[PDB]
């Protein structure tokens, strides 16, 4: 199906405790494949998936160079942001950057991304046109002016339409055993009496990949959007994910409830019920 590549970056200042810590990770879809941590014993970008290990020493050298340079620009940027927001040097602040691309089943570019956040809030983002900017405030507008002057968007468009797509294609081929395999959820419903007149029905999805999934409870065919407790999809640690959806039902009415499961690993949506 469709695929994505993303590089995430986080620098966190710590005044009086040395220089900011820098951590960057790369993903293809929901698979971590590279990492770099500035606090590591001897910081290098490291592989985190088998299909990237075949890349030569030249690949790792170049990647590590970029990671180290990005740690440095983040340090400069954190200093710049203190100025832009008239902030003291006393506090810890956070700078985040994500960039990457989405491709369709045939490998064509769907969308490119390049965005920043400061202290957990939107800062500046490259628009979908890969040519214009959305700045969140007057500080971000200062960055926008600099980046428009330097024709940064044009550079990003070139990368996102070119190398991003091409290297994603390469990774998808090299990791075709895993990246191009969807694992369907293993599903079941559990029942737990709360009291004499109420019971919890919990619909489970386990062992699935990728993470995207929809779990919905129906009562007499009606979506129970507003009464369903839905946990955040969580990693099992073996590359697969887990999720559940729960409803509180009047006792004796269990069979009026159906759980519905949609996942790309499934040929068609599943319907299940509690099986006493």
């Amino acid at each position: 199906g469709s695929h994505s590549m993303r590089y995430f970056h986080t620098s966190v200042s710590r005044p009086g405790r040395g220089e900011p810590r820098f951590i960057t990770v790369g993903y293809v879809d929901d698979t971590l494949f590279v990492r770099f941590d500035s606090d590591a014993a001897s910081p290098r970008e490291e592989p985190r998936a088998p299909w990237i290990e075949q890349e030569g020493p030249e690949y790792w050298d170049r990647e590590t160079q970029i990671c180290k340079a990005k740690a440095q620009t983040d340090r400069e940027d954190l200093r710049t942001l203190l100025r832009y927001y008239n902030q003291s040097e006393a506090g810890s602040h956070t700078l985040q950057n994500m960039y990457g691309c989405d491709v369709g089943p045939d490998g064509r570019l769907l969308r490119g991304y390049h965005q920043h956040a400061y202290d957990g809030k939107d800062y500046i983002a490259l628009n979908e046109d890969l040519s214009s900017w959305t700045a969140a405030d007057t500080a971000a507008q200062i960055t926008q002016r600099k980046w428009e002057a330097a024709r940064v968007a044009e550079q990003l468009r070139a990368y996102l339409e070119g190398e991003c797509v091409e290297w994603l294609r390469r990774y998808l081929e090299n990791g075709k055993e895993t990246l191009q395999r969807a694992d369907p959820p293993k599903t079941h419903v559990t029942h737990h009496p709360i009291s004499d007149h109420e019971a919890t029905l919990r619909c489970w999805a386990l062992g699935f990949y990728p993470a995207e999934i929809t779990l919905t409870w129906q009562r007499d065919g009606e979506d129970e959007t507003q009464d369903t407790e839905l946990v955040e999809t969580r990693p099992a640690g073996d590359r697969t994910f887990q999720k559940w959806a729960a409803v509180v039902v009047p006792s004796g009415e269990e069979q009026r409830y159906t759980c519905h499961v949609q996942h790309e690993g499934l040929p068609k949506p599943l319907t299940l019920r509690w099986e006493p």
Binding site: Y7, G26, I66, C67, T73, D77, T80, Y99, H116, C164
Partner: peptide, 9 residues
């Protein structure tokens, strides 16, 4: 692979 060129805000 990552974008080579540096960028500051």
């Amino acid at each position: 692979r990552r974008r080579w060129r540096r960028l500051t805000l």
